[PDB]
């Protein structure tokens with residue numbers, strides 16, 4: 250799995266489950282094309298988010314619906330969502346983890362590339 | 364000033380100056396209309412980004428060109444940029460600060476909302 | 479003011495007011511000598527924590543009582559407190575801001591150093 | 594393993610290896626007693642950091658020597674180290690992960706409790 254996510258809830262101290270995620274890749278044109286969609290599991294992760302074959306060199310957007318997550322907890326969210334945008338495999342085929350830490354009025358993201 | 368930014372550099376321990384910022388408001392179609400531009404100053408801030416008159420209820424995107432910032436320092440950035448998207452002024456007029464902390468492979472953002 | 483703090487609440491989107499802060503300096507023995515105290519104000523800051531005269535070269539601990547803060551809000555905190563420890567003024571006199579972002583099960587701290 | 598760590602390098606996008614870690618528990622007296630020491634591996638983790646038997650209810654300090662880590666990379670560190678202090682098992686025996694994200698002038702820590 251060359252593209253992984255790990256989402257954590259900074260308020261409750263647990264992984265953030267049921268967070269809807271979409272993966273897009275930017276066109277030759279420059280438009281975003283949706284490649285996959287999934288929902289985080291109990292460990293805040295998504296298995297098989299993208300195949301090695303579909304995950305080619307280019308610019309990617311990983312979109313997290315953080316707003317619905319906080320509404321499901323009865324907390325007021327500030328952000329509409331969190332998008333993370335990066336170039337992948339520009340200098341070779343690697344594995345990427347997009348880590349995302351959530352609070353109602355803050356989020357942090359870090360990329361681990363191997 | 365109802366919309367403020369504060370940008371910090373976690374590698375150097377200084378405010379991130381000369382970061383290009385753009386502010387957009389989503390129209391009903393879903394497209395983004397640019398309403399502001401600026402570049403952070405030596406304290407990582409931008410004065411007079413938008414007026415109260417322009418800053419009406421809606422969905423906003425604050426776009427930070429973090430890639431150009433790190434490249435100017437000779438560092439290899441991971442992200443293309445950082446966008447921060449939120450609904451504003453939907454429960455009355457408020458003031459907002461979008462704070463952004465930058466490292467080449469990480470960023471954090473926090474919102475402070477006051478009345 | 480050579481030592482400033484800025485404390486924010488990531489749950490509520492407001493500065494974290496009424497947070498008790500203490501500043502210590504390590505002596506040669508390794509024990510900690512208290513030099514300052516304060517409580518954050520409505521913007522999450524403390525004025526006049528220490529003077530330039532007192533703030534000499536050494537190792538400092540800035541101690542934030544984050545547990546009392548979250549308990550006052552009815553929230554269950556994980557940490558007993560947050561300490562931030564660093565060497566100051568070892569390459570000349572500088573000014574420091576210790577920024578601290580709080581959630582019940584997480585915190586982030588960033589230092590801004592100027593001359 | 595009831596007490597785990599996960600340390601990441603926000604500058605390089607890799608787990609932070611070779612970070613020295615000490616685990617202390619506070620005395621009845623109130624003094625810190627060292628229970629264990631280890632060093633993060635290539636995935637930023639430490640196996641067998643503490644046994645289930647030694648990890649009893651009380652107040653813990655997990656100490657990370659972040660200063661030597663940044664010096665090993667040739668970057669100037671601001672902090673002397675990062676200490677994370679918390680009560681464990683006050684309401685039952687659980688597993689704890691202390692996650693720690695490092696930059697030369699910033700760090701973030703989050704606790705995941707299961």
Ligand SMILES: N[C@@H](Cc1cc(I)c(Oc2cc(I)c(O)c(I)c2)c(I)c1)C(=O)O
Pocket residue numbers: 255256257346348349350361599601690692693694701702703705
């Ligand atoms: N166990 C799996 C999944 C996993 C990946 C990461 I990357 C991680 O590390 C962090 C650190 C911080 I600080 C965060 O705020 C967040 I979100 C994730 C953690 I815990 C777990 C693995 O090792 O691949």
Ligand SMILES: N[C@@H](Cc1cc(I)c(Oc2cc(I)c(O)c(I)c2)c(I)c1)C(=O)O
Pocket residue numbers: 369370371460462463464475484486521575577578579586587588
């Ligand atoms: N002096 C001005 C500007 C200012 C706002 C904030 I909001 C702030 O706080 C943080 C805290 C953390 I942690 C960050 O990573 C970042 I970026 C900013 C700081 I320092 C300064 C004011 O009070 O409005």
